[PDB]
A = this chain, B = another copy of it.
């Protein structure tokens, strides 16, 4: 009877798959090409993945039922539509969002959905964000860290965040591989991926957002970070302590709040890929129990262990209910 709403659950659609299959044959130097060739390539190292990402009502729903999971909140899998040229990305975002709405509508008690967009073209992405919010009535938004090797402090993306803030939709900033600004250090030992690169790429993006003052410009933004907040909850004291030096000697702009206060006000986190009771308890302690959500990270992680992690969490039942689904129901407006 614990209501479980999993918040970082990947899906894909045939038009996006086809575009990535084509993209896999190009000489794109993005570090995401490792993943793209592994999953979408002509000789894939991970040949079952397209099928598992594409499936919603077969194995996925069967696994949900066997583990007592009420819902998946679906998101177009990284790297979404962000690797394509602007026209292509804009077209495919629309298509993927329409298909997400269609998927959710077939089983709305079991699936909710996040829309995505192509920030390669900020003006067009702003229009699509508005369409996602008001015409499709999806539950929120998802984007995969950097676009065009730029981070979201860049004023280039202001029209995107203006539209997101106005829409009231939370934005899940999911990882992708380290951008070209930092990828040189992530070429070895599989560090391009979830084992290290994903967290460094995504957390650096979010820290730039905070320190740049994005949340003074757009104070009603809600951002969600998976992987126990990409470790930002662990760094809060030092982010705050060193901020004086940053604005005094480092040219950082003066902010209305402390870095950690933006993190608690404007961000929430999920437990995707971090099935640690100690890290969960730490995060609840420093963020508050309203700011932590459960996730599986299916199909990149299996459902049973993630479910058992939350069902056995050494926290009171009321807090467990918040983490398991209550918070997600609030943040992603799930009835």
Residues of A bordering B, CB below 8 Å = 34, 38, 45-46, 151, 153, 179, 181-182, 184-185, 188-196, 199-200, 204, 207-208, 211-212, 227-228, 231, 233-239, 241-243, 245-247, 249-253, 273-276, 278-279, 281-282, 285-286, 301
The residues of B that contact A247 with a CB separation of less than 8 Å are 190
Can you report 25 residue pairs joining A to B where beta carbons are below 8 Å apart?
A34-B250, A153-B188, A181-B184, A181-B185, A185-B208, A188-B208, A189-B250, A190-B251, A191-B208, A191-B211, A191-B246, A193-B246, A195-B211, A195-B243, A196-B211, A196-B239, A199-B235, A231-B235, A234-B234, A234-B282, A237-B274, A238-B273, A242-B273, A278-B282, A282-B282
Known: A46-B249, A182-B185. A236 touches B276 (CB 8 A): yes
Given contacts A193-B250, A241-B275, 9 further A-B contacts (CB under 8 A): A38-B249, A181-B185, A189-B246, A191-B208, A236-B276, A237-B276, A237-B279, A278-B286, A279-B282
The residues of B that contact A207 with a CB separation of less than 8 Å are 191, 196
A295: min CB distance to chain B, Å: 13
Known: A235-B231, A282-B279. A185 touches B199 (CB 8 A): no
Among A182, A243, A274, chain B packs the most CB atoms within 10 A around the CB of A182
The residues of B that contact A249 with a CB separation of less than 8 Å are 38, 45-46, 190
Residue of B nearest to A210 (CB): B189
The residues of B that contact A192 with a CB separation of less than 8 Å are 250
Among A46, A188, A204, chain B packs the most CB atoms within 10 A around the CB of A188
A245 touches B204 (CB 8 A): no
A254: min CB distance to chain B, Å: 11
The residues of B that contact A231 with a CB separation of less than 8 Å are 231, 234-235
A249: min CB distance to chain B, Å: 5
A238 touches B243 (CB 8 A): no
A206: min CB distance to chain B, Å: 11
Known: A195-B246, A243-B195. A190 touches B279 (CB 8 A): no
Q: Give A204 to B196 CA distance when docked, in angstroms.
A: 8
Known: A182-B184, A195-B211, A200-B200. A273 touches B190 (CB 8 A): no
A282: min CB distance to chain B, Å: 4
The residues of B that contact A211 with a CB separation of less than 8 Å are 188-191, 195-196
B181 touches A245 (CB 8 A): no
Known: A190-B246, A192-B250, A245-B194. A185 touches B238 (CB 8 A): no
